[PDB]
Amino acid sequence: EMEKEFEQIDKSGSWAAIYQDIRHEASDFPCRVAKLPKNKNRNRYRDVSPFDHSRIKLHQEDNDYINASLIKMEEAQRSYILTQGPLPNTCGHFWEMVWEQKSRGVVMLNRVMEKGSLKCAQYWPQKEEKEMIFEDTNLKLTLISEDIKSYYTVRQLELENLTTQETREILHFHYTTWPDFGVPESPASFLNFLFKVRESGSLSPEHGPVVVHCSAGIGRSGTFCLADTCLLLMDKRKDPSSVDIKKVLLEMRKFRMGLIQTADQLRFSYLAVIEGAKFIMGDSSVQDQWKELSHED
Ligand SMILES: CCCCCNC(=O)[C@H](Cc1ccc(OCC(=O)O)c(C(=O)O)c1)NC(=O)[C@H](Cc1ccccc1)NC(=O)CCC(=O)O
């Protein structure tokens, strides 16, 4: 029982040893293509790479590499693509992947600059009259509208393949207040945002996997996925309390290394998931409380 485990861990002061244990047991799979010298310019960090077995392959004959991994949750029936924050030369690759995987949504949980340091390129357009063209991938991206909230912004984007001329609506969900190596301000804020992502349709199985990213594509992004996936499980078990969060995280760590970067992010996923279960269980008003508590305005 989740809650029961959570308290025992908390009362026993064991978040760090439980977290170190997860790291110690995570899967070790090769990241050979990501390490090829010619892809060094495609990697934001030297110690963060996609496993060979689950990486996303660009459909270029030229060079199919993108530091991105397909996290496929069989029991939850949900797939996610987790990627680092694109670099100046991978903005086209990033959009080529969104297009090739049929993603309808993009979840960004970092800010372009954090602590004065640069974490991701400005890969989408900031003004509607200033659209972006990715020459290398023959794509055009246009900002269609944006809804700014106090800690997040939802943007409506139009991605066009210039080769075939088809256009697609891409929703972009941007969490602007999640510190690096940190946790959202509260479970309510987190959940209010996640439920926004779920209600947009983006995560539906008739579309490609949603794209999640932060600067490395592992801490913040792992956190968001573990809570989303645990909640889906709690809603399909009907013995919701048997969802074992450590086990779900180790399953996801088989597809991408380092998911969840601090013990505190692990502990927050437990708080988020337990608070989110109120909704699963049947509380028809906890959602409006999260919106109120999140202070969207
Ligand atoms: C899994 C192992 C990584 C843990 C230690 N590594 C780091 O902090 C980062 C990777 C990283 C991981 C999670 C993050 O999100 C946190 C979140 O979302 O909560 C962020 C992030 O957002 O900042 C950054 N890598 C380096 O700094 C390398 C360390 C290094 C340096 C030299 C050789 C080998 C490793 N430097 C770089 O890669 C510099 C770039 C270069 O030289 O190409």
Tab-separated table of C-alpha atoms and ligand atoms in Angstrom:
chain	number	residue	atom	x	y	z
A	1	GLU	CA	0.000	0.000	0.000
A	2	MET	CA	1.391	3.173	-1.485
A	3	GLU	CA	0.460	5.539	1.305
A	4	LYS	CA	1.605	3.088	3.905
A	5	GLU	CA	4.935	2.680	2.035
A	6	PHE	CA	5.240	6.417	1.663
A	7	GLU	CA	4.857	7.098	5.438
A	8	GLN	CA	7.220	4.329	6.448
A	9	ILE	CA	9.834	5.722	4.063
A	10	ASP	CA	9.233	9.236	5.295
A	11	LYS	CA	9.174	8.371	8.982
A	12	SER	CA	12.318	6.234	8.605
A	13	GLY	CA	14.208	9.053	6.903
A	14	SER	CA	14.932	6.774	3.921
A	15	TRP	CA	14.193	8.723	0.692
A	16	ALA	CA	17.923	8.880	-0.253
A	17	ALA	CA	18.770	5.182	0.432
A	18	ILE	CA	15.550	4.118	-1.305
A	19	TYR	CA	16.568	6.385	-4.229
A	20	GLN	CA	20.167	5.151	-4.353
A	21	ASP	CA	18.791	1.610	-4.480
A	22	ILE	CA	16.702	2.402	-7.521
A	23	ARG	CA	19.803	3.755	-9.304
A	24	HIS	CA	21.754	0.737	-8.233
A	25	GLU	CA	19.167	-1.658	-9.752
A	26	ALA	CA	18.326	0.261	-12.902
A	27	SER	CA	19.096	-1.398	-16.191
A	28	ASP	CA	22.402	-1.040	-17.982
A	29	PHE	CA	21.952	-1.170	-21.792
A	30	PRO	CA	24.397	0.168	-24.409
A	31	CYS	CA	24.260	3.701	-25.836
A	32	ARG	CA	26.671	2.988	-28.788
A	33	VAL	CA	25.148	5.123	-31.558
A	34	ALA	CA	24.860	8.087	-29.166
A	35	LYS	CA	28.608	7.745	-28.375
A	36	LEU	CA	29.793	7.621	-32.019
A	37	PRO	CA	32.139	10.595	-32.390
A	38	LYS	CA	30.115	12.137	-35.282
A	39	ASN	CA	27.049	12.595	-32.969
A	40	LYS	CA	28.903	14.514	-30.292
A	41	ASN	CA	27.272	17.690	-31.713
A	42	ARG	CA	23.851	16.022	-31.272
A	43	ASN	CA	24.199	15.518	-27.541
A	44	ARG	CA	23.572	18.260	-24.972
A	45	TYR	CA	25.280	16.318	-22.202
A	46	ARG	CA	28.140	13.840	-22.330
A	47	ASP	CA	26.691	11.704	-19.549
A	48	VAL	CA	23.090	11.562	-20.843
A	49	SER	CA	22.287	9.312	-23.747
A	50	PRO	CA	19.422	7.256	-25.107
A	51	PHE	CA	19.862	3.461	-25.031
A	52	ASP	CA	20.411	1.877	-28.471
A	53	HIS	CA	17.337	-0.357	-28.064
A	54	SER	CA	14.725	2.326	-27.370
A	55	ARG	CA	16.166	5.390	-29.163
A	56	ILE	CA	14.103	7.245	-31.683
A	57	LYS	CA	15.467	7.060	-35.193
A	58	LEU	CA	15.012	10.061	-37.448
A	59	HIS	CA	13.804	9.017	-40.867
A	60	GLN	CA	16.945	10.535	-42.538
A	61	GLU	CA	19.279	8.118	-44.422
A	62	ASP	CA	21.947	10.704	-43.713
A	63	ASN	CA	22.196	10.400	-39.935
A	64	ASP	CA	19.233	9.041	-37.927
A	65	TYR	CA	20.383	10.100	-34.475
A	66	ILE	CA	18.494	12.153	-31.962
A	67	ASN	CA	19.105	12.024	-28.218
A	68	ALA	CA	15.524	10.852	-27.528
A	69	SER	CA	13.985	7.665	-26.136
A	70	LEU	CA	10.638	5.892	-26.597
A	71	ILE	CA	9.397	5.044	-23.082
A	72	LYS	CA	6.749	2.360	-23.757
A	73	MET	CA	4.515	1.451	-20.743
A	74	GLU	CA	2.783	-1.811	-21.718
A	75	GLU	CA	0.541	-2.263	-18.666
A	76	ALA	CA	-0.373	1.473	-18.539
A	77	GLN	CA	-0.948	1.476	-22.272
A	78	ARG	CA	0.875	4.699	-22.674
A	79	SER	CA	3.915	5.694	-24.641
A	80	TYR	CA	6.046	8.758	-24.142
A	81	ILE	CA	9.047	10.181	-25.997
A	82	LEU	CA	11.549	11.798	-23.610
A	83	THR	CA	14.197	14.015	-25.043
A	84	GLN	CA	16.775	16.591	-24.005
A	85	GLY	CA	16.267	20.309	-24.727
A	86	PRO	CA	17.151	20.656	-28.414
A	87	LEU	CA	20.362	22.468	-29.340
A	88	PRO	CA	20.870	25.133	-32.054
A	89	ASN	CA	21.592	22.407	-34.577
A	90	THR	CA	18.932	19.890	-33.505
A	91	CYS	CA	15.867	22.123	-33.597
A	92	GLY	CA	15.097	20.746	-37.100
A	93	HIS	CA	15.697	17.118	-35.898
A	94	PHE	CA	13.463	17.731	-32.940
A	95	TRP	CA	10.630	18.899	-35.194
A	96	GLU	CA	11.350	16.154	-37.736
A	97	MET	CA	10.837	13.625	-34.901
A	98	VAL	CA	7.596	15.283	-33.677
A	99	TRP	CA	6.365	14.980	-37.270
A	100	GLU	CA	7.622	11.454	-37.971
A	101	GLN	CA	6.220	10.096	-34.619
A	102	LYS	CA	2.812	11.831	-35.116
A	103	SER	CA	3.106	13.501	-31.742
A	104	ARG	CA	0.253	15.908	-31.105
A	105	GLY	CA	1.670	17.345	-27.876
A	106	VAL	CA	5.034	18.643	-26.530
A	107	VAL	CA	5.642	19.039	-22.752
A	108	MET	CA	8.451	21.390	-21.751
A	109	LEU	CA	9.288	21.511	-18.017
A	110	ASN	CA	12.340	23.731	-18.033
A	111	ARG	CA	13.056	27.343	-19.046
A	112	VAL	CA	15.489	28.245	-21.846
A	113	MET	CA	17.814	29.894	-19.273
A	114	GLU	CA	17.990	28.666	-15.596
A	115	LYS	CA	20.465	30.024	-13.016
A	116	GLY	CA	21.915	32.231	-15.804
A	117	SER	CA	22.935	28.970	-17.613
A	118	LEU	CA	21.632	27.940	-21.045
A	119	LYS	CA	19.471	24.784	-20.950
A	120	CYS	CA	17.705	24.505	-24.307
A	121	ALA	CA	17.543	26.404	-27.623
A	122	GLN	CA	14.488	28.650	-28.316
A	123	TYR	CA	13.030	26.006	-30.686
A	124	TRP	CA	9.528	27.394	-31.255
A	125	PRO	CA	8.445	30.868	-32.413
A	126	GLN	CA	7.699	33.598	-29.844
A	127	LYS	CA	5.679	35.889	-32.207
A	128	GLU	CA	3.128	34.846	-34.737
A	129	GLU	CA	4.521	37.080	-37.516
A	130	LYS	CA	7.962	35.517	-36.923
A	131	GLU	CA	7.525	31.891	-38.015
A	132	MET	CA	10.449	29.437	-38.136
A	133	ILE	CA	11.710	27.409	-41.103
A	134	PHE	CA	13.955	24.292	-40.558
A	135	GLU	CA	15.751	24.136	-43.898
A	136	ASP	CA	17.526	20.924	-43.128
A	137	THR	CA	14.222	19.079	-42.480
A	138	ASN	CA	11.908	20.996	-44.723
A	139	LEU	CA	9.549	22.014	-41.949
A	140	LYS	CA	7.840	25.297	-41.057
A	141	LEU	CA	6.547	26.083	-37.532
A	142	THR	CA	4.159	29.012	-36.709
A	143	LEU	CA	2.954	30.301	-33.305
A	144	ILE	CA	-0.873	30.399	-33.669
A	145	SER	CA	-1.942	31.565	-30.207
A	146	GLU	CA	-0.779	31.147	-26.588
A	147	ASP	CA	-2.567	31.178	-23.187
A	148	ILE	CA	-0.185	32.384	-20.472
A	149	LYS	CA	-1.002	31.302	-16.859
A	150	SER	CA	1.098	32.233	-13.799
A	151	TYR	CA	3.288	29.173	-13.814
A	152	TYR	CA	2.571	27.639	-17.235
A	153	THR	CA	1.672	28.607	-20.818
A	154	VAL	CA	-0.170	26.543	-23.419
A	155	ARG	CA	0.682	27.475	-27.034
A	156	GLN	CA	-1.053	26.451	-30.196
A	157	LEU	CA	1.424	25.685	-32.950
A	158	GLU	CA	1.188	24.847	-36.612
A	159	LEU	CA	3.797	22.519	-38.008
A	160	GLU	CA	3.941	22.077	-41.706
A	161	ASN	CA	5.928	19.594	-43.736
A	162	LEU	CA	7.030	21.769	-46.699
A	163	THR	CA	7.723	18.633	-48.831
A	164	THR	CA	4.149	17.250	-48.709
A	165	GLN	CA	2.471	20.469	-47.596
A	166	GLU	CA	0.471	18.774	-44.803
A	167	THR	CA	-0.078	20.909	-41.709
A	168	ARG	CA	-0.582	19.804	-38.104
A	169	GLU	CA	-1.672	21.415	-34.901
A	170	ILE	CA	0.811	20.890	-32.079
A	171	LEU	CA	-0.095	21.917	-28.538
A	172	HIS	CA	2.914	22.937	-26.446
A	173	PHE	CA	2.605	22.747	-22.636
A	174	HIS	CA	5.129	24.810	-20.813
A	175	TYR	CA	5.818	24.544	-17.132
A	176	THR	CA	7.851	27.615	-16.325
A	177	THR	CA	8.306	27.253	-12.562
A	178	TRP	CA	9.848	23.786	-12.032
A	179	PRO	CA	13.409	24.359	-10.815
A	180	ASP	CA	16.147	22.190	-12.179
A	181	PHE	CA	16.923	19.298	-9.849
A	182	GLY	CA	13.790	20.378	-8.000
A	183	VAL	CA	10.131	19.756	-7.509
A	184	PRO	CA	6.996	21.608	-8.540
A	185	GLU	CA	5.683	24.084	-5.942
A	186	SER	CA	3.019	21.582	-4.868
A	187	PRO	CA	1.215	18.435	-5.985
A	188	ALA	CA	-1.800	20.611	-6.751
A	189	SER	CA	0.217	22.767	-9.156
A	190	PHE	CA	1.680	19.638	-10.767
A	191	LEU	CA	-1.670	17.885	-11.131
A	192	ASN	CA	-3.527	20.963	-12.359
A	193	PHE	CA	-0.960	21.085	-15.253
A	194	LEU	CA	-0.955	17.316	-15.892
A	195	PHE	CA	-4.739	17.224	-16.051
A	196	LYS	CA	-4.552	20.118	-18.559
A	197	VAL	CA	-2.250	17.976	-20.616
A	198	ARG	CA	-4.662	14.991	-20.335
A	199	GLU	CA	-7.801	16.993	-21.140
A	200	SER	CA	-6.266	18.461	-24.287
A	201	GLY	CA	-6.469	15.068	-26.058
A	202	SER	CA	-2.697	15.152	-26.725
A	203	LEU	CA	-2.051	12.000	-24.708
A	204	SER	CA	-4.723	10.019	-26.552
A	205	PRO	CA	-3.743	6.694	-28.136
A	206	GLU	CA	-5.009	7.776	-31.542
A	207	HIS	CA	-1.890	10.083	-31.764
A	208	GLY	CA	1.802	9.388	-31.618
A	209	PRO	CA	3.473	9.497	-28.251
A	210	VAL	CA	3.623	12.815	-26.494
A	211	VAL	CA	7.074	14.389	-26.361
A	212	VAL	CA	8.382	15.292	-22.904
A	213	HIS	CA	11.595	17.208	-22.329
A	214	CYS	CA	13.481	19.337	-19.820
A	215	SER	CA	17.194	20.200	-20.292
A	216	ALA	CA	18.527	16.541	-20.178
A	217	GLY	CA	15.176	14.765	-20.608
A	218	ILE	CA	15.572	12.733	-17.423
A	219	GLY	CA	14.821	14.423	-14.075
A	220	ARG	CA	11.870	16.674	-14.470
A	221	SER	CA	10.673	14.696	-17.472
A	222	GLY	CA	11.026	11.325	-15.638
A	223	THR	CA	8.993	12.768	-12.730
A	224	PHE	CA	6.159	13.898	-14.967
A	225	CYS	CA	6.059	10.485	-16.659
A	226	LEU	CA	6.181	8.338	-13.479
A	227	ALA	CA	3.226	10.243	-11.960
A	228	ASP	CA	1.235	10.115	-15.197
A	229	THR	CA	1.911	6.422	-15.605
A	230	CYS	CA	1.231	5.529	-11.921
A	231	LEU	CA	-2.182	7.298	-12.106
A	232	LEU	CA	-3.120	5.434	-15.247
A	233	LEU	CA	-2.269	2.158	-13.375
A	234	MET	CA	-4.246	3.141	-10.277
A	235	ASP	CA	-7.216	3.806	-12.546
A	236	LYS	CA	-6.967	0.406	-14.189
A	237	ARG	CA	-6.082	-1.872	-11.236
A	238	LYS	CA	-9.208	-1.489	-9.113
A	239	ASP	CA	-6.918	-2.372	-6.257
A	240	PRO	CA	-5.243	0.977	-6.850
A	241	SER	CA	-3.161	0.627	-3.707
A	242	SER	CA	-1.037	-2.187	-5.209
A	243	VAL	CA	0.626	0.201	-7.681
A	244	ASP	CA	4.299	0.042	-6.646
A	245	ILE	CA	5.936	3.346	-7.681
A	246	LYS	CA	9.544	2.036	-7.378
A	247	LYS	CA	8.693	-0.811	-9.697
A	248	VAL	CA	7.023	1.504	-12.274
A	249	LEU	CA	10.149	3.763	-12.236
A	250	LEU	CA	12.457	0.731	-12.719
A	251	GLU	CA	10.328	-0.406	-15.669
A	252	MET	CA	10.733	3.071	-17.248
A	253	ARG	CA	14.450	3.088	-16.452
A	254	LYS	CA	14.731	0.171	-18.901
A	255	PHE	CA	13.952	2.569	-21.734
A	256	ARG	CA	15.900	5.620	-20.693
A	257	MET	CA	18.638	6.072	-18.096
A	258	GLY	CA	18.414	8.275	-15.044
A	259	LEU	CA	14.689	8.922	-14.950
A	260	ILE	CA	14.133	10.929	-11.786
A	261	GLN	CA	17.274	12.759	-10.682
A	262	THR	CA	16.968	13.403	-6.939
A	263	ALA	CA	15.439	11.602	-3.917
A	264	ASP	CA	13.234	14.653	-3.515
A	265	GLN	CA	11.822	14.224	-7.014
A	266	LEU	CA	11.073	10.578	-6.111
A	267	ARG	CA	9.277	11.674	-2.939
A	268	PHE	CA	7.308	14.288	-4.872
A	269	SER	CA	6.114	11.681	-7.341
A	270	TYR	CA	4.683	9.763	-4.342
A	271	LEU	CA	2.930	12.912	-3.085
A	272	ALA	CA	1.657	13.716	-6.552
A	273	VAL	CA	0.360	10.208	-7.178
A	274	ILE	CA	-1.332	9.856	-3.759
A	275	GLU	CA	-3.040	13.295	-4.126
A	276	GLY	CA	-4.014	12.396	-7.739
A	277	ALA	CA	-5.648	9.163	-6.585
A	278	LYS	CA	-8.351	11.259	-4.855
A	279	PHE	CA	-9.542	12.026	-8.359
A	280	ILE	CA	-9.270	8.403	-9.526
A	281	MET	CA	-11.149	7.152	-6.486
A	282	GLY	CA	-14.156	9.408	-7.245
A	283	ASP	CA	-13.756	12.833	-5.695
A	284	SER	CA	-15.563	15.028	-8.261
A	285	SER	CA	-14.288	18.270	-6.732
A	286	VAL	CA	-10.536	17.775	-6.085
A	287	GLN	CA	-9.730	19.050	-9.582
A	288	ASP	CA	-11.268	22.459	-8.969
A	289	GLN	CA	-9.339	22.544	-5.702
A	290	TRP	CA	-6.043	21.950	-7.543
A	291	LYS	CA	-6.899	24.712	-9.994
A	292	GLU	CA	-7.680	27.055	-7.103
A	293	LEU	CA	-4.642	25.907	-5.132
A	294	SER	CA	-2.386	26.209	-8.206
A	295	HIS	CA	-3.121	29.940	-8.394
A	296	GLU	CA	-3.264	29.833	-12.255
A	297	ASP	CA	-3.799	33.646	-12.075
B	1	LIG	C1	22.815	10.711	-15.124
B	1	LIG	C2	24.181	11.328	-14.820
B	1	LIG	C3	24.136	12.859	-14.862
B	1	LIG	C4	24.312	13.515	-13.465
B	1	LIG	C5	25.521	14.504	-13.543
B	1	LIG	N1	25.358	15.273	-14.748
B	1	LIG	C6	24.822	16.484	-14.916
B	1	LIG	O1	24.334	17.269	-14.050
B	1	LIG	C7	24.572	16.768	-16.415
B	1	LIG	C8	23.358	16.061	-16.961
B	1	LIG	C9	22.047	16.498	-16.411
B	1	LIG	C10	21.127	15.559	-15.832
B	1	LIG	C11	19.876	16.020	-15.350
B	1	LIG	C12	19.504	17.402	-15.433
B	1	LIG	O2	18.279	17.719	-14.942
B	1	LIG	C13	17.880	17.899	-13.608
B	1	LIG	C14	16.336	17.963	-13.614
B	1	LIG	O3	15.649	18.015	-14.592
B	1	LIG	O4	15.918	17.940	-12.376
B	1	LIG	C15	20.451	18.362	-16.020
B	1	LIG	C16	20.155	19.825	-16.120
B	1	LIG	O5	19.078	20.287	-16.323
B	1	LIG	O6	21.180	20.575	-15.883
B	1	LIG	C17	21.681	17.869	-16.482
B	1	LIG	N2	25.768	16.350	-17.197
B	1	LIG	C18	26.908	17.048	-16.972
B	1	LIG	O7	26.985	18.070	-16.298
B	1	LIG	C19	28.140	16.688	-17.777
B	1	LIG	C20	29.172	16.188	-16.745
B	1	LIG	C21	30.353	15.683	-17.568
B	1	LIG	C22	31.352	16.619	-17.952
B	1	LIG	C23	32.463	16.110	-18.725
B	1	LIG	C24	32.515	14.729	-19.079
B	1	LIG	C25	31.496	13.814	-18.705
B	1	LIG	C26	30.388	14.281	-17.927
B	1	LIG	N3	28.604	17.937	-18.430
B	1	LIG	C27	28.510	18.075	-19.766
B	1	LIG	O8	28.058	17.131	-20.463
B	1	LIG	C28	29.096	19.312	-20.443
B	1	LIG	C29	28.890	19.312	-21.977
B	1	LIG	C30	30.110	18.791	-22.782
B	1	LIG	O9	31.284	18.908	-22.474
B	1	LIG	O10	29.745	18.143	-23.928
